[model samples]
Target: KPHPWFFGKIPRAKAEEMLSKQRHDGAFLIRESESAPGDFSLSVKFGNDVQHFKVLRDGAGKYFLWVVKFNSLNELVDYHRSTSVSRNQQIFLRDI
Candidate 1:
């Protein structure tokens, strides 16, 4: 997944620390902001490969479910869906 511009500007040491903290936390939430609707998709890419996980949207434009993609090895290759539910949300790390 692409890191946000602000996060990219952070020092490597600080960035690592923040990432470590987040990993230890296990989960995090990003509330929909005024600039964006509650519906959003999480995407990632590795080399020439790209993947997207979308949170299904309700009639009211609310998302409440998520799906993930995995390879034959059962390794999470990509995210397929996302939802307001905490369990549906996740982060994908890729080498920059």
Candidate 2:
């Protein structure tokens, strides 16, 4: 089964709309990457705007945002669900 947060084949505009509806900091969703087919993107809400990060796969088939790799997509998202973004130091993942 697919992950609840995984919205397949949706464009960036639609993804932004989905996250925008919540209007909560850290509200996020995962969707297929627009420019890179077969890959994914992580879209998270921040104040009035949403940030997009390219979710990439490694040589070992692990998924990662920018640093550490995860065994599964769910594992990656869940890990961030609690962990705060180091760069901002104030943002953490939240449901959309």
Candidate 3:
């Protein structure tokens, strides 16, 4: 798939569905949230629970934000879109 690069907000759940293919693996990423100086940007609500967004990226950086997990975003990132495709166009990504 070509992945995505939007210039606006996307429905996070719908976002997760499309990006995750509604399928999850052990894959995840701690991508930073671009909400405010500091606010809940990646995390989501699960009934009465909440978890942040998670993604899958390798050293080669063909990572797609596979799905949201129970962690938080780290490092500098662009949450403008929910998924990432290019390596040189991303953050100092490391296995979280």
Q: Evaluate model 2: give its TM-score.
A: 0.64
Candidate 3 regions exceeding 4 Å error are 1-41, 65-96
Off by over 4 Å in 2: 68-96
lDDT of each model, Cα atoms only? 0.39, 0.86, 0.42
Highest TM-score against the true fold, candidate? 2
Better of 1 and 2 by lDDT: 2
lDDT of 3 by residue, 3-37 (tens): 23431345455445444532344222222445543
Pairs of residues clashing in candidate 1 = 53-80, 67-81
Candidate 3, residue 82: the lDDT equals 44
Point out where model 1 deviates above 4 Å: 1-20, 23-25, 33-35, 38-55, 60-62, 67-96
| Order by TM-score, highest first | 2, 3, 1
Please, what is the TM-score per model? Answer: 0.23, 0.64, 0.24
User: 24-65 in candidate 2: lDDT tens per residue?
Assistant: 699888988898868999999998888999997889999988
Candidate 2 residue 28 C-alpha distance from true site, Å: 1.0
